[PDB]
From a paper:
In [name], the activation of T3SS2 by bile salts is regulated by two transmembrane ToxR-like transcription factors, [name] ([name]) and VtrB (VPA1348). Furthermore, we demonstrate that the periplasmic domains of the transmembrane proteins, [name] and [name], form a functional complex that binds bile salts to activate [name]’s cytoplasmic DNA binding domain, which in turn induces T3SS2 via the downstream transcription factor VtrB. The structure of [name]/[name] periplasmic domains reveals an obligate heterodimer where [name] recruits structural elements from [name] to complete a β-barrel with a hydrophobic inner chamber that binds bile salts. Our biochemical data and the structural analysis demonstrated that the periplasmic domains of the inner membrane proteins [name] and [name] form a stable complex that functions as a receptor for bile salts.
Author numbering:
A (entry chain B): 0, 31 to 161
B (entry chain A): 165 to 253
Write the structure that this text describes.
Amino acid sequence: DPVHFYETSYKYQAADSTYMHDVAINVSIKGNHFTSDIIIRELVKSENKNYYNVIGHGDIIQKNTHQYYLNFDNIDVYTGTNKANMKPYKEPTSISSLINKSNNIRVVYLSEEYVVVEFFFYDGQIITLHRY
Amino acid sequence: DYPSLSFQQDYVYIFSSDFQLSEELGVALINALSAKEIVPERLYVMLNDKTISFSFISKNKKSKNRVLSTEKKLNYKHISEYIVNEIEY
Ligand SMILES: C[C@H](CCC(=O)NCCS(=O)(=O)O)[C@H]1CC[C@H]2[C@@H]3CC[C@@H]4C[C@H](O)CC[C@]4(C)[C@H]3C[C@H](O)[C@]12C
Ligand SMILES: C[C@H](CCC(=O)NCCS(=O)(=O)O)[C@H]1CC[C@H]2[C@@H]3CC[C@@H]4C[C@H](O)CC[C@]4(C)[C@H]3C[C@H](O)[C@]12C
């Protein structure tokens, strides 16, 4: 069974505030299992910088050629103000609710160099990931 | 759980339950980008109630991805100008 890697980054802005996320996503898929690493830098005017490292793994389930589901076995959340020293952090609701639940990923385009998906962040987001 | 493809022209793919908004935004995007001599390989846009996201795939297969949350709906002109500015810079 070969391993396939998917990597992307995105920036989140809010039209009604200064909240911003800079997010890198790294996903590896082997068979029906996946490992995900999500690195977040969180900014806002009323508070100083903040980093989050979200490590998870679980089952990826193929329903159609374009309909997949990610069901996490576990997710760990680390936080810190400097990427050098991060420390464990109790899972927020938006993380713990993803465990033992099938989260929707819909593929809209597939090439050998990238894939375009609608997925469940922010209750609906479209993004392109580079294929490795 | 996601809007269906409601507008597809040239390199633009817009996923939204609102056809009028989809076509208005899609044409505004093609007009503004062509005027600046920007021709993406593909441009994907998703319009939700409270969230807008897009993926810009450049000629070199590199991607730029953005999410914009808004408490009140924006008209196609503002959404187009936001997307184009993020792509431009
Ligand atoms: C808990 C964190 C800080 C929240 C905060 O700043 N609280 C103070 C303001 S308040 O006064 O208390 O409201 C936030 C900041 C960024 C978030 C991720 C963004 C990507 C992704 C989006 C998906 O939709 C759900 C999963 C997802 C991985 C998210 C997990 C978690 O939610 C994160 C880490
Ligand atoms: C975008 C709409 C779907 C909205 C919706 O409700 N999505 C499911 C949500 S839910 O599951 O119900 O919750 C769809 C529904 C009807 C479509 C027109 C049909 C005639 C004509 C056919 C031509 O080929 C292209 C132009 C044309 C005017 C079309 C434009 C657009 O495609 C329209 C408006």
